[PDB]
């Protein structure tokens, strides 16, 4: 008994959940009207991709 024989892996597979519920970045950088700098608009971003 000399060595050990192995089957080397061939490909790499990455499976994750389907992409949905993206963070509303399109509502921040693309707005019809912006805000003055003194009254700067602050939006909290959570529970989203």
């Amino acid at each position, epitope marked *: 008994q000399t060595s050990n024989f192995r089957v080397q892996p061939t490909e790499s597979i990455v499976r994750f959940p389907n992409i949905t519920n993206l963070c509303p970045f399109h509502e921040v950088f693309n707005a019809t009207t912006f*805000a*003055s700098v003194y*009254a700067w*608009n*602050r939006k909290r971003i959570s529970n989203c991709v």
Partner: nanobody
Amino acid sequence: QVQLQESGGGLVQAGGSLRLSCAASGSIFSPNTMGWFRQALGKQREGVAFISSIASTSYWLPVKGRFTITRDNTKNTVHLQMNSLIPEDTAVYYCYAVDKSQDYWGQGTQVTVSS
């Protein structure tokens, strides 16, 4: 989405009286401060007078007696009373709602005086 209803403008002779009114419907979050701006024909935009939510008033022109601000807490509206009207105040007016996060603007009222 906030709608600022403007009403009470038009043609008035010298020394007349009128009552501008801005009603803020929509978001208009609780710590609001309401103000009025003046836009002379082809000139810069200056601030008529501002009223806060604690009834504190800050007039941005030596104009006391001319403008008086009345507050309606039940409907969160602001009325501007105009008296002793003189030709140099002939300008369109917009009301300014700072709210807390995003400030808004009115549509416009034509205030005119001549003789």
